[PDB]
Design a protein around this ligand. Structure first.
Ligand SMILES: [Mn+2]
Length: 277
């Protein structure tokens, strides 16, 4: 019924795919060694996953640090395509489903054309990565971002700025957030782009609209060609709304298992990573 994943890094291993460096500082030799370390860790994680009933993994945005920066000092595709092909072969052989989640500052709906172009650059880098790994069912998950002023107009820019981007749209899926965009609203944008919807259970609890969870899932699921993807997290009882708990509580698991209208791939977003169950 369920396949599990966790994002970016692994705690028992001390493996992470998300090492970066300060911009100061972005020179070929510095980035090469950070990428190398990241890529080595991607393998340790895939291999670990194969032996631990994990089928899903989110690669960190920083896999190749600053890979979409206008001053990235070399051809990272040329540099890493062979090793990325190799890591992708392992993933497939291991039945692993890879995904990526661009940062808070990735917003193609921004009024600022300079923030749009840099956002599309991060997205294009991310999608190319998935292609270099040969991840057919790879997903690229995106929140709809700030309603700068107000939404609707922000939504329209978002759709226009993404509709040309073929390679990104091959992987793109959209997620609901705790603030501006509920599932209903996201379904509308996704349908406009012809991409699927990732329901984020904690965000949905925080910002439900008028759909109950079971209702949000039952609408979101048909949007997937393959098997639908879900985000599961629990509210940290001491921290601000939306902040992720170290471990998904048993109640939150059951609320999700009850609401499922079919099989799903669940990405567990807990601070505890592979221990977050
Ligand atoms: Mn969240």
């Amino acid at each position: 019924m369920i396949r599990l994943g966790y994002p970016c890094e692994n705690l028992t291993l001390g493996a992470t795919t998300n090492r970066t460096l300060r911009l100061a500082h972005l020179t070929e030799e510095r980035v090469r060694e950070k990428a190398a370390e990241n890529l080595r860790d991607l393998e340790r994680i895939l291999r670990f996953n194969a032996d631990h009933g994990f089928a899903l993994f989110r690669i960190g945005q920083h896999l190749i640090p600053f890979a979409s920066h206008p001053l990235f000092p070399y051809d990272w595709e040329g540099a890493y395509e062979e090793e990325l092909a190799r890591l992708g072969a392992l993933a497939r052989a291991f039945g692993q489903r890879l995904s990526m989640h661009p940062g808070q500052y990735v917003n193609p709906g921004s009024p600022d054309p300079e923030v749009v172009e840099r956002s599309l650059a991060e997205l294009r880098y991310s999608a190319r990565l998935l292609s270099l790994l040969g991840a057919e069912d790879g997903v690229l998950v995106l929140h709809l971002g700030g309603a700068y002023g107000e939404k609707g107009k922000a939504l329209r820019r978002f759709v226009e700025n993404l509709r040309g981007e073929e390679e990104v749209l091959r992987y793109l899926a959209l997620a609901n957030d705790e603030r501006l965009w509920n599932v209903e609203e996201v379904l509308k944008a996704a349908e406009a782009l012809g991409v699927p919807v990732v329901v984020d259970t904690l965000h949905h609890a925080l910002n439900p609209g008028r759909l109950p969870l079971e209702e949000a899932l039952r609408l979101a699921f048909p949007t997937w060609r393959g098997r639908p993807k879900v985000h599961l997290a629990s509210q940290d009882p001491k921290k601000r709304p939306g902040a992720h708990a170290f471990r998904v509580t048993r109640e939150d698991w059951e609320r999700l298992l009850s609401a499922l209208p079919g099989p799903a791939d669940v990405m567990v977003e807990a601070k505890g990573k592979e221990q977050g169950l």
